[PDB]
């Protein structure tokens, strides 16, 4: 009978970076999705494998809310089958993904006049990430034909690069908050239901 804590997810004060995205397990509650779609705050509300209108009528199990902050033109990369820095090295969605990607502009919270430097993306990884795999490991990596055995060789590249968030930036570079809801369609007893 109790409500699901979407307020603790969407209306949180701080979001984690896309390399270290926050995963919250939502279970044992009634989820009212009608306050999400009818809100005009969300610029992107794209659901794969389920219609958003039907979200109230279905009972899910193991609902996951994945929250992070990415820039404006990378929101298209939060989709199945997309390529880019975020899809390959930061946050990968499976090909058989069922769920919803919700993203909204957060320029008035996540930008500072001198530049906000709290959100960082994994610029490079040795291989592409597996679906729903998190890489919080920050490791020094080499450059080519010379090893990273000190300063002696070609200087060693760092994987994590911070976003330059300023309020004067044009759209597409502005901070966008992304919450990815992931569901499972009726296998074990369902714990998250609509009204």
């Amino acid at each position: 009978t109790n409500l699901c804590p979407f307020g603790e997810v969407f209306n949180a004060t701080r979001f984690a970076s896309v390399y270290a995205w926050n995963r919250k397990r939502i279970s044992n509650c009634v989820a009212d999705y009608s306050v999400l779609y009818n809100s005009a705050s969300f610029s992107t509300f794209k659901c794969y494998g389920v219609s958003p209108t039907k979200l109230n009528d279905l009972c899910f199990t193991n609902v996951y809310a994945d929250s992070f902050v990415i820039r404006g033109d990378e929101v298209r990369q939060i989709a199945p089958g997309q390529t880019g820095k975020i899809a390959d090295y930061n946050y990968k969605l499976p090909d058989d993904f069922t769920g919803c990607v919700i993203a909204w502009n957060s320029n008035n919270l996540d930008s500072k006049v001198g530049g906000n430097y709290n959100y960082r993306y994994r610029l490079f990884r040795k291989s592409n990430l597996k679906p729903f795999e998190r890489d919080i490991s920050t490791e020094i990596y080499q450059a080519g034909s010379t090893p990273c055995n000190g300063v002696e060789g070609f200087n060693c590249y760092f994987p994590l690069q911070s976003y330059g968030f300023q309020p004067t930036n044009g759209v597409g570079y502005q901070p966008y908050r992304v919450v990815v809801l992931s569901f499972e369609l009726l296998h074990a007893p369902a714990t998250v239901c609509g009204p």
Partner: nanobody
Amino acid sequence: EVQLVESGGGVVQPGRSLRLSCAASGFTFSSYAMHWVRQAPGKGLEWIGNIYHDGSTFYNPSLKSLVTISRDDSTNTLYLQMNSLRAEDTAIYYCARVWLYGSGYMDVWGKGTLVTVSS
């Protein structure tokens, strides 16, 4: 020209604090992000921390609460406070500089400082 110099190394007791300084000369300290890296004898390089112009400090998940990165922009210097020194922190420390408007290339490096912990 561009130059990074460090100070604060020596032989100290374990658990006593240290303050390693990285002075930058020849370039404006802004618009670049500063890194602290250490390498142990017989081991490869290990990244410690990052600090930006905002004051956002990012640490390695492997080591927590041992270090504190403190930037200062009046005199273009970078400070590291090391607390609760363990025996395994014997290492050569390096100060690194990345440009914020490019890939994460660390460009010029500090010469390094030696920290030896003993009992």
